[PDB]
Amino acid sequence: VNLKVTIDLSNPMMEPGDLLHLDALLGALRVSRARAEHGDAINPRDYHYDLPLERYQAPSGDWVFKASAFKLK
RNA sequence: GUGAACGGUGGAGCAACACCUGAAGGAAGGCUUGAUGAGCGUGUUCCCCGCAUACGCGGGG
């Protein structure tokens, strides 16, 4: 749907030393949702790639999600 | 599976010691509780105001 997400927050955020990717956050939330359904005894790595994001494919393997790292205003 | 996940700013420490709000300074100069209101003259039909509506009532000097 080619969309943009803005997040505003109450307390100031712990500033990320490296890039805070949107796909990382959505994968962690999908892992938390998978812990909600199938309990805590899961592999997190089977579900954080099941995301509502498209995947860009590099020419030699090595796909990435179509999300971007968060920009701070 | 948020370069994530985990992580106590902590422990102790006297605002305290001494210090006169005090010296001087007139509530006075003048002022009847004494009265005031307590008793002492006119001798008979004359104007004017209202209610009436004139049969009379009240009333000014």
The DSSP bridge partners found for residue A55 are A65
Specify the DSSP class assigned to residue A52.
S
Instruction: Give the span between the Cα atoms of A20 and A6, in whole angstroms.
Output: 13
Specified resolution (Å): 2.6
Instruction: Give the span between the Cα atoms of A69 and A56, in whole angstroms.
Output: 15
Q: Which nucleotide is nearest to A27 (CA to C1')?
A: B1
Instruction: Give the span between the Cα atoms of A4 and A72, in whole angstroms.
Output: 14
Q: How was this structure determined?
A: cryo-EM
Please report, in angstroms and rounded to a whole number, the separation of the first and last CA atoms in chain A: 24
Strand B neighbours with CB under 7 A? A 14, 16-21, 24-25, 27-29, 31-32, 44-45, 48
